[PDB]
Amino acid sequence: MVHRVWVETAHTHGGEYLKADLGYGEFPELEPIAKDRLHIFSKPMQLVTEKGKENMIQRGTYNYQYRSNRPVKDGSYLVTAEYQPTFRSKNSYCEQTRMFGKNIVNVGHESADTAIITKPVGQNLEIVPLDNPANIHVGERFKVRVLFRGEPLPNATVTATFDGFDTSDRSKTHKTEAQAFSDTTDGKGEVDIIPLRQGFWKASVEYKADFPDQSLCQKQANYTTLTFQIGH
Amino acid sequence: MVHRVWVETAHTHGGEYLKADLGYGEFPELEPIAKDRLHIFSKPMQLVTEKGKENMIQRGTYNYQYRSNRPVKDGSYLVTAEYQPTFRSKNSYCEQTRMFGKNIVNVGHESADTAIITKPVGQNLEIVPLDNPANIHVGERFKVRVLFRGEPLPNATVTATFDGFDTSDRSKTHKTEAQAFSDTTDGKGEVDIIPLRQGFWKASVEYKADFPDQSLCQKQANYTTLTFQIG
Ligand code: NI
Ligand code: NI
């Protein structure tokens, strides 16, 4: 089972704390970070607001649950998560894995701001939304841009699915990996996700390339996710 | 312009001539086969029925239009098209390109036969439907099996789109159209396509590998499509 990183947020109105979940595993089934994987998530998830990036506090029954330090006003914020760089052997050579997740959260039933969500946060491989998904209806186009090391990434495959699309016969050894959208980015790194259903959506991109310092490691793999809501 | 291959058929009731179209270009816009491309489609499209595979005649206003030799009865049949194998240089090395198209045609309403459509026709990379698309409603699963050189192909990316999903880019980018479905085949080479809209669907698979005879060419690229109706 391949483990991937994503972020989820419960519905939050103005004045209350922001509850968020770090998904490490098979979307959308949240699972506790196992003991041997704890070191991979040594840094807490971050909340991105007008004042910048602030750490969140890991509160809750399970170790994947987080809450904001302070109550949040109405707006459109980001919540980011990172699988910290790890090394592993393959064949023989070294490969460094890094993973990223980003969730767009709208606090308030009428919040469709774009000042914060459209600014890159500096993830090695990042999906930067170019619009607020709260403005996107079913069948319309939601424009995003893929950045790698701060630059647009052309011809990258961006796939997308939603919670409930693939549910049949799910178990610990079954696929449930089907995507409801697939396209490639253009020369500006942009692509238009076209959602055919309302729900909780996850878009995925990945990039395998050479590690910059060949004297320490050979290959690099990045897996980046963007989660958001379509519809109300 | 990429230039992929697919097959289309018009609504045909039993007893009349089955008219079909060879699409060579950007789905779903049919275009006449250019002068310098005629040699690529040297063999006509084939109609697969109970009696087997038969050739179709290139009749019509445009060179991509084909008509069946004799009128067809009710049932479920296949219409197949082939981009004949061509060689080209890349970097340097040789690559052999082959493309295939298969359309499931239900001649007559209520016809949902599976004896013909589910039998492989021997394409180098082939999408063999394991069900008739007429039995599949929106949200249900349409199982297909991907075959390469006669054997099932695991972990192959099968995508699917439909006419009207992506409406843009006349010629400004000529990039491949967006897909409304993507998944990978299991160890039996099978995958369940989940269509979220009614209309004329095309599923796509591609396989790149080493050319068999390394003393003639190095690489081989195969592009295969399966077209059908949902609702
Ligand atoms: Ni509410
Ligand atoms: Ni009719």
Q: DSSP of chain A, one letter per residue?
A: ---EEEEEE----TTSPPEEEEEEESTT---PPPGGGGGGG-S--EEEETTEEEEPB--SSSTTEEE-SS---SEEEEEEEEEEEEEEEE--EEEEEEEEEEEEEEESTT----TTTTS----SEEEEESS-GGGPPTTS-EEEEEEETTEE-TT-EEEEEETTSS-TT--TT-----BSEEEE--TTSEEEE--SS-EEEEEEEEEEEE-S-TTT-SEEEEEEEEEEEE--
Q: Which two tokens stand for residue A61?
A: 């029954």
Residue A131 φ then ψ, to 5°: -155, 165
Query: CA B206 to CA A107: how far, in whole Å?
Result: 43
Phi-psi region of A61 (alpha: psi -120 to 50; beta: other; left: phi over 0): alpha
Q: A203 to chain B: which residues are within 8 Å by CB?
A: none
Strand, helix or coil for residue B35 = helix
Q: B185 to chain A: which residues are within 8 Å by CB?
A: none
Q: Chain A interface, mutation test: which of B165, B181, B198, most A Cβ atoms within 10 Å?
A: B181
Q: Are A82 and A56 in contact (CB under 8 A)?
A: no
Nearest CA in chain A to B173: A186
Query: CA B23 to CA B7: how far, in whole Å?
Result: 6
Nearest CA in chain B to A192: B178
Residue B131 φ then ψ, to 5°: -155, 165
- Closest ligand to residue B229's CA: 2
Q: Identify residues of A whose CB sits under 8 angstroms from chain B CBs.
A: 159, 165-166, 168, 175, 177-184, 186, 192, 194, 196-197
Contact A178 B175 (CB under 8 A): no
Kindly list the distances between the CA atom of residue A25 and the CA atoms of A55, A104, B4, B114, in Å, as whole numbers in the listed order.
22, 20, 36, 39
Query: CA B203 to CA B228: how far, in whole Å?
Result: 9
CA dihedral B11, B13, B16, B18 (to 10 degrees): 40
Q: Are A225 and A128 in contact (CB under 8 A)?
A: no
Q: Peptide bond before B28: cis, by omega within 30 degrees of 0?
A: yes
Q: Which two tokens stand for residue B134?
A: 């007429």
Strand, helix or coil for residue B146 = strand
Q: A162 to chain B: which residues are within 8 Å by CB?
A: none
Q: How far is B18 from chain A (nearest CA, A)?
A: 33
Contact A186 B194 (CB under 8 A): no
Breaks in chain B (C to N over 2.5 Å), named by the residue before each, are: 91
Q: What is the resolution of this structure in A?
A: 2.3
- Closest ligand to residue A11's CA: 1
Q: Which two tokens stand for residue B188?
A: 């039996």
Q: How far is B172 from chain A (nearest CA, A)?
A: 12
Q: Identify residues of B whose CB sits under 8 angstroms from chain A CBs.
A: 141, 159, 165-166, 173, 175-176, 178-184, 186, 192, 194, 196-197
Q: A197 to chain B: which residues are within 8 Å by CB?
A: 196
